[PDB]
Design a protein around this nucleic acid. Structure first.
Lengths: 75, 323, 162
DNA sequence: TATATATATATGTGTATATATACACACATACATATACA
DNA sequence: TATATGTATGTGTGTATATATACACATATATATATATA
């Protein structure tokens, strides 16, 4: 059967947008952990959802985009 | 069944034709309701983004297709294209031109043939190439397509011939692929072979075929993977083989060495290896439309798959010799 | 690639072996790099933006890595390369050939043991014949306080290679 | 361009040793491949 | 989860086949290595 999808349902079903929509092994996955006033970058040896990290990432890069866009400006 | 996949590349024109059941020559209701005119299924399949038979993929499905996008990507990068498809009672010819801007109405006749053919001219100039293609660009692109066809010929089933520019593609086995890739670095070499099986469905339905060469004149680790028909370049299947071989290599290296103190890692273990891995894996996901990298939990292989010990032993032997 | 080209040059310089050929994996496997900044005109391989797409020559034409950084890096890397040349390849080995230790070597009665260093292996066959007179020679020596080793023919002199 | 190293080769008559292959067969050690199961 | 069951290696003997290597000793020559000159 040939189906036509909209953006919404597509993005919920398809991994092409943000990565896998379930937990997979992400090679090089790191996080920052505090050990007595010291930041350490440590590996996270546990599967996680790439799309879940992407929704954080998309907003964060929108913010840093705005920062560059305004850095030579008045406001 | 699909008994053949004919691929051709000549004077810039690119063509691909298969002979299973054709694409349904039938009116698509919802697509016509959207378009306010008569739209048939091949027009949806070729001109409607996010559309196809894989929008709702099963967890056991081993087709590469998933997004309903690839075919329209081909059309959008075509100066002109021709979709021809026949279902045994009708033939259907539709021309799709100017990067999907001109979609001519289709022409439907009676025919008793059954096949699907896409034929197109890319926009080589818009994409950075000469018009027409230079001698070097033409030769490079022909070689690359020829390679992809050889890869298909190893992945495809045994009743299916892969043709490129009308010659059949030789390489129906991962051993043939390994020999092709190592003909220069290491001619006349030893090919370690394994069929990696799983015990639980769906994985047990899809054994992975593996061929590896081990040479001192290999400078880094290297793999070729066809997974679900996709020539992808990154995925935890590779790491599964790498880690397994490394654990055995470390064990036997400390055994064979009477130094008994030196510590080697995966780079030492694997930098003299060239591996070809071909087959299907159910339930995988990708990191984008290109499908460069498959996404999976590593434990899928730790739980379900086993690498035959004869292959591991052979490999470890060759590698520890080199060490 | 830039670091590797410099590392290969100075490795062949510093090494008086002058024959060994190292590649990028040898050059770079001991490196951790952070690169931060903006590059105009790049493209990606998908929405995720895992991989940026660019012509390599953009950097060959336009960018230069400061030589002080390259020099520092090459220095650290070649130090490790020579340590792995002194080590790894030339690591610890084992015991020598034609050597029969005594039962009391390096122990609580270590000082009262002998090393009967012989000239070849037929002499060691004679010494093995003679140190095993079991009860036919109660006053003779045996392997409880005697060892055997071969001198390899003629000894090298050290009085003119020093 | 200079004064200065330290390692490097070849000759005869001597001193010491190393190692690959064939051929037959009783015997020893290593899985591994199933087949009941469990 | 133990069991066999058919696979694969592996030294060993006498009489054959074909090779390999360390060291001493004197002196003339050599090819690249080195200061410090600058």
């Amino acid at each position: 059967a040939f189906e036509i999808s909209d953006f919404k349902e597509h993005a919920k079903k398809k991994s092409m947008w943000a990565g896998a929509l379930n937990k997979v092994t992400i090679s090089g996955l790191m996080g920052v952990f505090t050990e007595d006033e010291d930041l350490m970058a440590l590996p996270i040896h546990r599967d996680h959802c790439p799309a879940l990290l992407k929704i954080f990432d998309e907003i964060i890069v929108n913010a840093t985009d705005h920062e560059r866009a305004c850095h030579n400006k008045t406001k | 069944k699909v008994t053949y996949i004919k691929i051709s590349f000549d004077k810039g024109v690119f063509s691909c034709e298969n002979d299973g059941p054709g694409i349904p020559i039938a009116k698509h209701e919802q697509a016509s309701l959207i378009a306010k005119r008569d739209v048939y299924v091949p027009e949806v399949a070729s001109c409607h983004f996010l559309a196809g038979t894989n929008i709702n993929k099963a967890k056991d499905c081993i087709k590469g297709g998933t997004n309903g996008v690839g075919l329209k990507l081909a059309m959008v990068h075509s100066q002109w294209a021709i979709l021809t498809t026949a279902d045994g009672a009708q033939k259907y010819v539709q021309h799709i031109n100017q990067r999907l801007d001109i979609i001519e109405p289709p022409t439907i006749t009676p025919s008793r043939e059954m096949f699907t053919r896409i034929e197109l001219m890319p926009v080589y100039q818009e994409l950075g190439y000469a018009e027409p293609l230079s001698e070097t660009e033409q030769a490079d692109l022909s070689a690359w397509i020829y390679l992809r066809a050889c890869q298909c010929a190893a992945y495809v089933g045994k009743g299916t011939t892969i043709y490129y520019n009308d010659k059949p593609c030789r390489t129906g086995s991962v051993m043939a692929l390994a020999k092709m890739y190592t003909l220069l670095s290491a001619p006349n070499s030893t090919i370690h072979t394994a069929t990696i099986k799983a015990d639980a469905k769906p994985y047990s339905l899809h054994p992975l075929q593996v061929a590896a060469v081990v040479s001192p004149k290999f400078k880094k680790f290297e793999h070729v993977s066809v997974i679900n028909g996709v020539n992808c370049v990154k995925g935890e299947h590779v790491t599964f083989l790498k880690k397994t071989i490394n654990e055995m290599v470390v064990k036997k290296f400390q055994q064979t060495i009477k130094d008994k103190n030196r510590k080697t890692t995966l780079r030492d273990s694997c930098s003299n290896i060239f591996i070809v891995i071909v087959g299907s894996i159910p339930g995988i996901e990708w990191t984008g439309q290109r499908k460069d990298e498959l996404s999976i939990a590593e434990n899928v292989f730790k739980t379900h798959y086993s690498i035959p010990s004869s292959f591991l032993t052979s490999m470890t032997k060759s590698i520890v010799d080199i060490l | 690639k830039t670091i590797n080209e410099m590392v290969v040059k100075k490795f062949q310089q510093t090494i008086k072996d002058k024959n060994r050929k190292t590649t990028l994996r040898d050059s770079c496997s001991n490196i951790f790099i952070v690169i931060v900044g903006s590059i105009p005109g790049i493209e990606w391989t998908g929405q995720r933006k895992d991989e940026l797409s660019i012509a390599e020559n953009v950097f060959k034409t336009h960018y230069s890595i400061p030589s002080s950084f390259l020099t520092s890096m090459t220095k650290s890397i070649v130090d490790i390369l020579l340590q792995s040349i002194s080590k790894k390849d030339n690591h610890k080995q084992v015991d020598v050939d034609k050597y029969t230790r005594a039962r009391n070597a390096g122990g609580k009665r270590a000082q009262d043991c002998m090393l009967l260093a012989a000239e070849g292996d037929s002499a060691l066959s004679l010494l093995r014949t003679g140190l095993t007179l079991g009860k036919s020679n109660p006053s003779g020596p045996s392997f409880d306080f005697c060892g055997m080793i071969s001198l390899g023919g003629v000894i090298m002199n050290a009085c003119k290679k020093v």
